[PDB]
Amino acid sequence: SNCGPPPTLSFAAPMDITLTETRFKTGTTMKYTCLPGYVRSHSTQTMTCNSDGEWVYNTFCIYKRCRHPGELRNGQVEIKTDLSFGSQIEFSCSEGFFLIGSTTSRCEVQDRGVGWSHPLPQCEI
Amino acid sequence: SNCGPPPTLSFAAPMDITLTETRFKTGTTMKYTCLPGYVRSHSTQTMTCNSDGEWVYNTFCIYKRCRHPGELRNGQVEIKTDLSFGSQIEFSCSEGFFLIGSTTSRCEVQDRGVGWSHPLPQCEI
Amino acid sequence: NVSSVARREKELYDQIADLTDKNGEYLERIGELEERQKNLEKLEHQSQVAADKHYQEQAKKHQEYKQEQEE
Amino acid sequence: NVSSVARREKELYDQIADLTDKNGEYLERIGELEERQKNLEKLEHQSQVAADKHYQEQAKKHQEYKQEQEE
């Protein structure tokens, strides 16, 4: 009637290392930090062990979001969805012009935050 | 060295409906509640009296943002600026189409947050 | 289509609302909390000066006593 | 026109990344205040439960006195 090892999360890592003991005591709460690329959506950053013996929590980290890549002069930037971490964008030129640079960009971890895996292409004559 | 009565703000009103004594010792700090239409922009919501006989402070209430009013089928929703408290938006229809409603809408207070003074018009034929 | 680019208007402008709004509710909370923490520090402070007092009073009511085992 | 519309699109997307960032710094702070205030709650508690152990002992020590004042 008690708690097994912690379930791997897509958005957070422990603060005090996991030796993955065969079990944990009912009621123990474990401290989590945000993975690179994520920020916090909730005040409290943890997960406890309830009376049944499972970890119970909220989703405390969500995606960081890149800024706009800039105004593509004489071309258009296609945001399928958003600029949220690991979202791809695609660029493209007007009929007069051709693309010099990259056609795709990914929102990626760039040291202390999220940036653009490739910079703005240019639309040349 | 001392200050005088608190300056009337355009984003917040003094906490207690008090007499406002025409003199305040250097160091006295007044507390403020956000005016309706505004949200907190800084953590602490105060103003202090320095040794210059002046009231110095931050700009600690900004405009609440209205939500987008719905999609206007067969019409344009025109946002000059933003949907900030006070800002006006104007509607208009497509060429064949005529407008059954109000031409413009103000972002005013509704409940204790903010809403749209006039509802989305109709664009029918 | 221009209905899914004007759904994009609303879809974005909606984020900038429901964000701008919870920006000012996190500030609301930091307010309540930064305040509370000041009201507590004065509560505990006033409990040390009270404790320091009553001690200083007992230390007196001792010397008076000791000064009676001789008197 | 082509270049001011795509400018608003930049502005909105610039704002959204920023709000979700402020949103992050904010409950970073309310995370740490809610922490102290949990610590301080326990500290002050500990203090009281002590100053109650002691008040209880001194209450027996004065009960002993009152007795010896015949014995």
Sequential DSSP letters for D6-57 = HHHHHHHHHHHHHHHHHHHHHHHHHHHHHHHHHHHHHHHHHHHHHHHHHHHH
Q: Do chains C and D touch (3 or more CB pairs under 8 A)?
A: yes
Task: Please judge whether B40 and C6 are an interchain contact, meaning their C-beta atoms are less than 8 angstroms apart.
Answer: no
Helix, strand, coil percentages in chain B from 3-state DSSP, rounded to 5: 0, 40, 60
3-class DSSP state of A62: strand
Nearest CA in chain C to B83: C13
* Helix residue ranges per DSSP H, C2-59: 6-58
Q: From CA B102, how far away is CA A76, in angstroms rounded? A: 34
Token readout for B61 is: 């209430």
Q: How many CB pairs under 8 A join C and D?
A: 47
CA–CA separation, A66 and B21 (whole Å): 51
d(CA B23, CA C61): 46
Give buried/exposed letters for A74-86 (b at 16+ CB in 10 A, else e). Answer: bbebebeebbbbe
Indicate which technique resolved this structure: X-ray
Spatial distance between the Cα atoms of B75 and B91, rounded to a whole number of angstroms: 7
Q: How big is the CA angle at D70 (ends C58 and C69), to the nearest 5 degrees?
A: 45
- Angular region, B72: left φ>0, alpha ψ -120 to 50, beta rest: beta
Token pair in block for residue D36: 């102290």
CATH 3.10.129.10 fits B1-63, yes or no: no
Residues of D in contact with C5 (CB under 8 A): none
Chains in contact with A via at least 3 Cβ–Cβ pairs below 8 Å: D
- Specify the resolution in Å: 2.7
Which amino acid, B31? K
* A43 CB-near residues (< 8 Å, 6+ apart): C29, D27, D30, D31, D34
Q: Measured between CB atoms, which of C16, C26, C44 is closest to D27?
A: C26
Domain ranges of chain C: 6-69
Cβ atoms of A95 and A105 closer than 8 Å: no
- Residue A59 and residue A11 in contact, taking contact as beta carbons nearer than 8 Å: yes
Residue in chain A lying closest to D35 (CA): A44
For tokens 């704002």, the residue is: D15
The domain locations on chain A are 1-63, 64-125
Q: How far apart are CA D71 and CA D53, in angstroms?
A: 27
Tell me the three state secondary structure of residue C63. helix
List the single residue in D7, D11, D21 with the smallest CB-CB distance to A39.
Answer: D21
The A12-14 sheet, strands edge to edge: A12-14, A30-34, A46-49, A55-56
By C-alpha distance, which of C46, C40, C15, A91 is closest to D12?
C15
CA distance D64 to chain C (A): 17
Are residues C30 and D34, on separate chains, in Cβ contact within 8 Å? no
Token pair 């202090």 in the structure block, residue? B48
Q: Do the chains contact at A39 and D20, CB–CB below 8 Å?
A: yes
Per-window interface: A 102-121 vs D, CB < 8 A:
none
For residue C16, the chain B residue with the least C-alpha distance is: B65
Identify the H or E element spanning B92: strand B88-93
Q: DSSP character for B4?
A: -
Q: Considering the domain B64-125, what is its CATH architecture?
A: Ribbon (2.10)
- List, in order, residues 6 or more apart from A27 with CB less than 8 Å away: A48, A49, A50
B1-63 and B64-125 share one fold: yes
